[PDB]
Amino acid sequence: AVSDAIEARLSFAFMLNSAVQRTGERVTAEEIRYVASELEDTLGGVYSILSQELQLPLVRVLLKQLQATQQIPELPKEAVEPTISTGLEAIGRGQDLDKLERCVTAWAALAPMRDDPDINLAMIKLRIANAIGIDTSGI
Amino acid sequence: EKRTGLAEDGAKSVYERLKNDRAPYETRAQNCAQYTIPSLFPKDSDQTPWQAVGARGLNNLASKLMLALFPMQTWMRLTISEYEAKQLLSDPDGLAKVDEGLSMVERIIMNYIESNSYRVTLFEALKQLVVAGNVLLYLPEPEGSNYNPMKLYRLSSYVVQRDAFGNVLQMVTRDQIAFGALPEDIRKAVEGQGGEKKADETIDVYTHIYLDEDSGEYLRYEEVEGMEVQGSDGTYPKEACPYIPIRMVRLDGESYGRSYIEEYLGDLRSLENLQEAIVKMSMISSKVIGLVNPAGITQPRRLTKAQTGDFVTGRPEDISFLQLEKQADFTVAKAVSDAIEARLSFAFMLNSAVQRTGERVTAEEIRYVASELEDTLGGVYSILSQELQLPLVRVLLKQLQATQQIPELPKEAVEPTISTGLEAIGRGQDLDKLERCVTAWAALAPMRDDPDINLAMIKLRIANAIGIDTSGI
Amino acid sequence: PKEACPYIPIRMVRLDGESYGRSYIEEYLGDLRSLENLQEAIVKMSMISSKVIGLVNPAGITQPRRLTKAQTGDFVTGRPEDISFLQLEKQADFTVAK
Amino acid sequence: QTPWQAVGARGLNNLASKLMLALFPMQTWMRLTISEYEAKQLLS
Amino acid sequence: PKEACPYIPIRMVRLDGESYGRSYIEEYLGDLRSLENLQEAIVKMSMIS
Amino acid sequence: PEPEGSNYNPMKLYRLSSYVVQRDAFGNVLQMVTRDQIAFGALPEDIR
């Protein structure tokens, strides 16, 4: 019993998906999702640390190493010292994409008044995008 | 020049005097770390723990806070200053310009934070911020566009003093650089003051900062062996000091802060003290020891040699195995251990405190007891937003305008307001009140074709009580 | 001015006719001490339960030295009647207090 | 000499595996974007 | 050049004011030894059984 | 190492025991001394 009590505690600290595996009770579905979002919470911890400690320095060195051996076909001055994004940004499923179709879905909220009696949909469709935080340049 | 005022008697002399009202606060931090991760605050002056509970709790607490305060997302939102926003009324072409560039500084601050590896030290800061009362952050001048990291001083190797209103009066750090690493200016000055030094001798390097009674600003200087350092003098303005000392739990009328783990320390020690005896008990239980009666026929030699399947000269009355049979008292101790370990799991925002092996846990209690972890976390978050998030942004803004990495903008955006929290994620109360008001205009769709109802005045009062701007609706 | 003093003294529980206020935890203090006084004896009890202590009968053949030295799997000169472990067996009274 | 348990073994291995597939996938996991100072230059 | 050295030394757990970093497993080492020290006696017991 | 053309330029990894580091106050790298343990029959002819 003591060994299994410890082995469970460790299984959490090694992001083992089989720490939910408690042979004690009829494990529900609503705790599985919640105790799994504690494994994601402590993993997002080490990931956002190693992004700074090992991911970005590795890219930053390869960038300057490959521009120096001219395998990088030259580009207009604006892109020789850029900004290096990583994480959910680079997978393509980042906060930017979130805020846009979180704003598209707020313009379907004023569909039961697209035919607006003096409501003025023009300023609202702009303030909605203001609070969210898009660019609004040319919308 | 001999300096007086606060640094009248040197630097190291102030460090050792203020080390006396700080000594209780590091002893407290020492105890809390001994039961979590000792490496964060070793018990060296004024070995691992038997349990990993506090260990996984401390790490999970910091992780949840670091991912809350400092995400990959933009987590600050600059917006036009009120006094200079009333000036630009009804001018949306020259007003969108001021907010757009404000949202450019929104990004510049991030890129500086990303590429300079601020996050990785902020984590080690939050870990320290929780088990120890305080941390000291130093972010030097940008100095070009290089790799300008952040420096972190743990409580034991720095010292602070505050006034009545809680403002910083003086701060004396204390690096412990090895001689073979000091700058050549300081290095030759050291062995040239008496005694040549080896390459591994450790040199105490202090760093006084203090307000000047005459000026309205801070004066600093490095200091080695009792004599001031070459080229180390300098001044910082009072409103933008790049040395930030952060407290966790305030106690208005005190130089330092209280730690977070401190408040639940009594139970945390009860668990470690128990887990020790429990594990030690488990080792005794799994220890197999025979007991051959010497007045008997069975000889101990023949048994240890015997293979499986062997028959052996002896009777079963002579041998017996050492039974511990403390099964009863173990269940008592293990039940208390689990009861305490659970109480702490709530105080460490462990999502696995719902994990009660007692009953068929429903779906409707999980949501409610999870909204107590959200309720006690929003506590420390909205505190650290003021104690560590807002001061950090406020310093980098004035630090980056001073090295003109901020492309200039129209006067309205030189002193704006710095919003944080759910505002900057973009899912704040503003967006809430807007589509909570749109959804009140779809409620009068079964009378859009209104017989004399007048939808114009109603569609306006709805937005009034809610609290939108109503400017041009 | 009387209408805008920047020193504010706040009470929790008013008692009109008194300078200070009553605390909120005060009203439930009696149970709060009952719990602490109990948890003390409870926690202390678990420590005695998990304390393993042998009891070698000196008039017996089994000597305490040989046992502490022995490895796991070793057989040892002795009888099981000589050794016993200090049982607390307050399982009944524990469940009451808990 | 080897350990009596494979707990840390599979734990350590699972820790590395999850991190490498998070940090370094077959996917493109960095995103370069225009520097801010030289992006305001190329406006409109 | 200082800005692009191709030798990169990485730390795991920072402790600002030290050349090297702390390991991740170090923080939970006590329980990891409790388990192994136990698993030995358990496995050894099963062989005796 | 440097790309050195477009060849097979792998990555070298030094474990903690066969390398050593020193840093300053702000945490920047001061010096690094590695330590391979190559067998004589493998060294380049210059060093050999």
Numbering used by the authors:
A (entry chain D): 343 to 481
B (entry chain C): 3 to 48, 55 to 481
C (entry chain B): 245 to 342
D (entry chain D): 55 to 98
E (entry chain D): 245 to 293
F (entry chain D): 148 to 195
Task: Please quote the paper that reports this structure.
The bacteriophage portal protein (also named connector) is found at a unique vertex of the viral capsid and is essential for procapsid assembly, genome encapsidation, tail assembly and genome ejection. Its overall architecture corresponds to a ring-like hollow cylindrical dodecamer. However, portals have also been described to be able to assemble as undecameric or tridecameric complexes after overexpression, although they are only incorporated into the procapsids as dodecamers. The portal protein of the T7 bacteriophage is coded by the gp8 gene and has a predicted molecular weight of 59 kDa, which would give a multimeric complex of 650–770 kDa, depending on its oligomerization state.
Nevertheless, self-rotation function (SRF) calculations performed with MOLREP indicated that the T7 portal was composed of 13 protomers in the data set 1 crystal. Comparing the peaks at χ = 30°, χ = 27.7° and χ = 25.7°, which would correspond to the presence of dodecameric, tridecameric or tetradecameric NCS, respectively, the highest peak was found to be in the χ = 27.7° section. Therefore, the complex present in the crystal was a tri­decamer, with one ring per asymmetric unit and with a solvent content of 49%. Eventually, the 3D classification of a subset of 1200 particles with RELION yielded a map of a tridecameric portal at 7.8 Å resolution. Built as polyalanine chains, the model consisted of nine α-helices. It contained 194 residues of the total of 536 amino acids present in the gp8 monomer. The resulting tridecameric partial model was used for MR with Phaser against data set 1. The model was then subjected to rigid-body refinement by protomer using REFMAC5, which moved all of the protomers significantly (3.5 Å) towards the central channel, shrinking the particle diameter and central channel. Solvent flattening, histogram matching and NCS averaging were applied with masks generated from the cryo-EM map. The correlation between NCS-related regions of the map was 0.849. This DM procedure yielded a fully interpretable electron-density map of the particle.
